[PDB]
Amino acid sequence: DAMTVLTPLTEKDYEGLKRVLRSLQAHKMAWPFLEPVDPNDAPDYYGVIKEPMDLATMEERVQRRYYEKLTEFVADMTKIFDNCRYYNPSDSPFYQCAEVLESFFVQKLKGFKASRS
């Protein structure tokens, strides 16, 4: 909505962002996304995926107050899942993790936006 696009993230907001990030990191199906993709696990991953992203990179950015608006936090998180569904076929375990964990992220994001008032 309006707040998501326009309102700068505060320290109070960042407590909520850390909580969302921690809940995804704790999720059983987040295991493929905790750390940057290992090129030795994924042939030509870094020649195919132009903007890699992972939850540890996101954790560093949250710690550093990298994000000015919620939209940018959402865009990084969306990269994790969109990258995975582009690189992997739809029957891959990685792809299935992206489906589950994105739906979880959307639930938690909705709770974050509601409590932002």
Ligand X SMILES: Cn1ncc(Nc2ccc(CN)cc2)c(Cl)c1=O
Q: Which residues bind Ca ion (CB under 5 A)?
A: 82
- Least separation, in Å, of the C-beta of 1 and Ca ion? 20
Structural contact between residues 28 and 9, judged by C-beta atoms closer than 8 angstroms: no
**1 to 60, contacts with ligand X by CB under 6 A?**
32-33, 37-38, 41-42, 45
- Residue 109 binding result from ligand X, Ca ion, none, given CB thresholds of 5 to 8 Å by partner type: none
**87 to 106, contacts with ligand X by CB under 6 A?**
87-88, 94
Secondary structure of 9-61 in HEC code, one letter for each residue = CCHHHHHHHHHHHHHHHHCHHHHHHCCCCCCCCCCCHHHHCCCCCCHHHHHHH
Measure the CA dihedral 79/81/87/92, to 10°: 170
- Least separation, in Å, of the C-beta of 83 and Ca ion? 8
- Least separation, in Å, of the C-beta of 97 and ligand X? 7
